[PDB]
Design a protein that fits this description.
homodimer, 8-stranded mixed beta sheet, about 15% helix, globular, hydrolase
């Protein structure tokens, strides 16, 4: 009956789902890994029926591994590439030991008894990728590119030889490009399988950063039991130099390497490369350092000449999410753009001329899912119903729009290769997770998962319920929030309040989707829990998000104060027992809101918080703030240091000491500022932990610490 | 009339004293620094009369400094060496800019109007020392020895050329020798002024240790404002290799350097060198790695031959106090030895034969003050009155003992060169500093300082008072303690208790001497404050101190638990509100005591605490524990990690992150062990702070944090 935090932290209430869903090249089937990671099994998109087991570690020949982590198909589906021993590096990068598995059917009529072969005889590999004809795989290892020719006995050749850790990266981004342009690979085959292209990152002049590593626990780093070690990598802080970047091509036949003569500012960016359907056209996406001029080039991989295809210019900045929504077709390509104030889908000719604006209106297109070359329909997700929701839509060749989603909430689709079917994952405030198979019209073909068991289990517990609300700030802005109330709620009682937020640019926490979290636990203890997405958050167009430009944090903190004030006007909240907390930008926002000047907060917890933007990285910080050289006044007003003497309420600072994202420096420097100001506060510092602060009992310990801090300090 | 924490942390109640007292060669006078640091003044030991100002910042010619830090007298009485700009390195090492001040008299007979001279035209100097005839000064800079010849234009020469930071040190000890053998100089002139002797430390193969540095404040390390830095030095942890050491001599006339052919274990120590009165005999003190075999050699600085003079072995270990109580006379020398279970004074001939044991009884000799060659009398300090006290004693040639000190408490003497007078600094629980001049029967000749003004100031405040008590443990051990009750105290009421201790081997906190501390402040807030010296503390003989040998912490923690249990039996103590705290070893003991298994503590604070002895340095740790591989089961039973699952009560961990003594690693590794056990605790980590955790507002912030933590956790 009573909600138990350990059940929350252990994932007891995580809804059933399907992991490792990979659509097959035929457009009719998908595959999924079995629960134990022993098998890859093929299922029908049209019916959900199991077709056959495609791969099985207990049937494959020469298979030394017990489990695998992930897999991908070759483009024609005749082979699998299977990843084992996946070892994360940063958020998106990792190494793994990959294996090639052919799917030819055997004497007995099964595909499961074939010989598995190593991708490489050397060490683990990064970002392997098939050629369009499936005859080659390129991968990166020790910052160099390698090429394996599957029709040549898996013969391996070395494409680059100047890769050097902390100096030169070939085919993979450095830390800041990876985190802030959100990708792990800059390595492409041309459409006729004759050229490789890659970005070469010269980070030799980027500043290095190092932090200590101890032995710790979960995992214990046993070589460090007596003397600590360290982790060193290149990380440019705001205004410092970024990697020098070049686009290079490798002629597979002739072994010749060339550099594309790309017009680009000396301090500009290349967020992505992508070969088109035209073997002579490599797309190169570029940004200026202000990140407000997105210039798309077509490079000839042999002549090295580049032509400007289009420029998308923002009055503020271009956002990273546009880059992976550019999909190339014969004769056309897609683009997401906020040029009219809202994220919308645009359809261009391969000559760079706009063919049509596919979507319009005061809502945001979230994902471009694809163009059906058969009938000319476009598929995409959008929040047209409401900033809180997401639905699947289709627009036919004549401009007719159809909402495919059957239920209102959060619909996440996964389309078949042919766009004929898709798997839908649906959630809302009281629907944990419904997984369905659907046709092109959105009609439900089969319910795979309804999580009735979880629903039954949860029925025996007293679970506080989320509800949405809106309110108007004193200057007339309407904000979306949710409120979770304790059991036996009464408007004649007086409740303490915990505010949760994240508040970062373009982000949203107030969404019609299901979850049980530490906030639910606090509500079960008798707290009213509230989350409001203030100004600067996403879902509501460019004007709402980018009104923070060049002076972030300030308006967001005002809107959190406004939220506390609105709550204080309610007869059932105790105005003196309002707490606030958050993680990452939400931790920074805890600091900014508690030192805003309006003394509304009794207590707060800041987890892994940036405290001065000069400590954070170039691409993210400068996107919103430009450089400290150009915007000293903005950095001043956005710093938590500047307003620290106005800190009001009992503060707990939490940080992982091995945080490669928001450096522990942020906490150490800010703590010392508070010491010299004479402010008293609490700390919890986690050994060897990164931005996610997890491992072993860490998460349970942390949320118990947060629980007790608010119990004691509210 | 309430005590104010700021007055305590600002040192408002520091008693008046006398700085830089040096006895002059005539045996009749001493010099001292003026209280403002602008003058050096000669006084009479017999009368206290001010004889003359010897040096005056405002009278010297070409004197560019306004104050100075310290000074030394040339043995020939013709010069001062004055130190300015003293810049600490570790506990005892420092640089300073030194000046030679001639003491010639002018036409008006005074010494105050001479032209001051620089010791060196180069950079700041370390540990300058005069030759016996006063014509030469040797000093250390950049790990090399330099020689200044005052007879020949202050001509400077370079004695060693191989000194190199973190590799080779000439004439000064490495980190662990300085900290744990308690000295800063290994540099000596022979009795006839012809030879220099020094220890050369080769720490090239000692492991490096590094910790981060941030910008911080007070001081701000400005180059680290955007990117942190680091501090690196050599620090051998328990069982790791120590410096390779040898004794070298330098022939001042011929410039020949020789190495003494000293038999020493390959892993042994040379804690001191000291030239005797015989120009051909250099005393070299050596230990084995177990530190239980003290071998005294006489080295011939020209022939390099060494002869073993004396071997003193302990069943446990030899203590640092012996080294600087070896004083050399023509034909004799002194030694303190615990061979009979108590530190006693032994008298040897220069041939190495024991002449006699001078002192005896069940008490400890603390300082050997000197031998009066005129009448054969010995002067020393001891705790014969009580482990709590220290008095000055005299034993004549016949063996009659006389106690010189007039008052019972803590008597610290400084004798004239003839041993005919001494200056006495006296304190007890009710007496801040009382400074007198005395003759060698102990008779008070003059009271120089009695601190009536401080007494007056304190009379206007409600000051809790210490009083001594004893109690017997359940095992029958009688322990000494003090107890400070609020000035409100009544046997009617029940009080919370704060226990303070240090508890480290041979230390004592329960002493008949005056102080006002944070403990005084807590008592003034209504806590009963108690301190007990458990087993393993000093002052009670070798059996009582060294019963912890090879398994430290364990018995000390039992005695703190016994202390809490005794207090819990008292009718005026609330046994549910007993807390404990300490710093350094006292922080380690807080951890050990709160996890002893008997749940007697409600809260505790561990400041800068060692947590596993394998993290701490060679000389200290191995003195009590030997190495980890020799004593694996002792290191396990002494580790705070082993018993952490029994931690009971609310704990606050405090640590400076730049602690070069007890590494922050101790706290980070122990915090993580607690996280995985699921124990809740608070933290306060101070950026850029060392073992003393101070700087700007730091101490006031830290003791405010300690105060509130106990107030809130009771």
């Amino acid at each position: 009956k009573a909600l138990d935090l350990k059940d929350i932290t252990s994932g007891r209430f995580r809804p059933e789902n399907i992991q490792g869903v990979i659509p097959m090249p035929d457009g009719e089937h998908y595959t999924q890994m079995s629960a134990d990671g022993t098998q890859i099994i093929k299922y029908s998109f049209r019916t959900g029926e199991k077709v056959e087991v495609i791969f099985d570690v207990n049937q494959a020949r020469e298979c030394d591994f017990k489990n695998f982590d992930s897999y991908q198909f070759s483009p024609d589906g005749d082979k699998l590439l299977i990843a084992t021993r996946t070892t994360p590096i940063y958020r998106h990068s990792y190494t793994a030991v990959h294996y090639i598995y052919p799917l030819k059917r055997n004497d007995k009529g099964v595909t499961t008894n074939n010989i598995i072969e190593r991708l490489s005889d050397g060490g683990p590999q990064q970002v392997p990728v098939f050629s369009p004809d499936g005859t080659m795989i390129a991968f990166v290892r020790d910052n160099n590119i390698f090429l394996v020719k599957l029709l040549y006995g898996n013969s391996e050749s070395q494409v680059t030889e100047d890769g050097k850790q902390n100096s030169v990266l070939n085919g993979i981004p450095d830390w800041v490009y990876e985190e802030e342009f959100g990708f792990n690979r800059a390595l492409e085959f041309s459409a006729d399988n004759t050229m490789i292209a890659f970005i070469r990152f010269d980070e030799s002049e980027v500043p290095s950063y190092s932090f200590p590593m101890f032995a710790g626990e979960a995992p214990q780093i046993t070589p460090l039991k007596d003397y600590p070690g360290e982790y060193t990598y290149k990380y440019p802080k705001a205004g410092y130099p970024n990697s020098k970047v070049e686009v290079r091509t490798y002629d597979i036949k002739s072994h010749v390497t060339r550099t594309m003569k790309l017009p680009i500012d000396a301090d500009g960016y290349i967020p992505r490369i992508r070969f088109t359907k035209d073997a002579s056209k490599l797309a190169v996406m570029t940004l200026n350092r202000h990140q407000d001029r997105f210039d798309l080039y077509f490079a000839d991989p042999r002549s090295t000449l580049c032509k400007l295809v289009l420029r998308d210019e923002s009055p503020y900045y271009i956002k990273e999410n546009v880059f992976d929504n550019i999909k190339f077709y014969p004769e056309t390509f897609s683009l997401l753009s906020e040029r009219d104030g809202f994220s919308h889908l645009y359809w261009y000719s391969m000559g760079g001329n706009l063919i049509k604006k596919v979507t319009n209106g005061k809502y945001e297109v979230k994902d471009f899912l694809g163009y059906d070359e058969a009938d000319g329909s476009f598929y995409y997700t959008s929040n047209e119903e409401s900033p809180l929701r997401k639905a699947v839509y289709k627009i036919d060749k004549k401009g007719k729009k159809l909402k495919l989603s059957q239920r209102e909430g959060t619909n996440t689709p996964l389309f078949s290769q042919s766009m004929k079917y898709y798997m839908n994952k649906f959630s809302n405030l009281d629907t944990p997770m419904l997984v369905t198979l659907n046709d092109n019209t959105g009609k439900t073909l089969k319910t795979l998962i309804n999580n009735d068991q979880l629903k039954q289990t949860l029925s025996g517990y007293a679970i506080p319920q989320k509800e949405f609300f809106t309110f108007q700030t004193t200057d007339g802005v309407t904000l979306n929030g949710w409120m979770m109330k304790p059991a036996n709620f009464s408007t004649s009682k007086k409740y303490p309040v915990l505010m949760y937020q994240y508040s970062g640019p373009g982000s949203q926490q107030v969404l019609d989707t299901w979850g049980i979290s530490w906030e639910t636990y606090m509500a079960s203890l008798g707290y009213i829990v509230v989350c409001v997405d203030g100004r600067g958050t996403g879902g509501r167009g460019e004007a709402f998000e980018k009104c923070t430009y060049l002076k972030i944090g300030v308006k967001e903190a005002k809107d959190q104060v406004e939220t506390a004030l609105y709550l204080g006007k309610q007869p059932y909240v105790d105005k003196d027992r309002i707490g606030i907390w958050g993680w990452s930008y939400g931790g920074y926002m805890t600091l900014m809101s508690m030192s805003e000047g309006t003394p509304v907060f009794k207590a707060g917890v800041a987890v892994a918080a940036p405290t001065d933007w000069r400590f954070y990285d170039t691409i993210y910080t400068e996107r919103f703030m430009r450089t400290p050289k150009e915007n000293a006044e903005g950095y001043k007003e956005s710093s938590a240091f500047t307003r620290a003497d106005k800190l009001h309420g009992n503060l707990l600072l939490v940080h992982g000491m091995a945080d490669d994202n928001v450096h522990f420096q942020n906490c150490a420097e800010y703590a010392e500022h508070l010491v010299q100001l004479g402010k008293q506060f609490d700390m919890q510092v986690y050994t060897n932990r990164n931005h996610g602060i997890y491992g072993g009992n860490t998460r349970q310990h942390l949320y118990t610490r947060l629980t007790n801090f608010f119990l004691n300090n509210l």
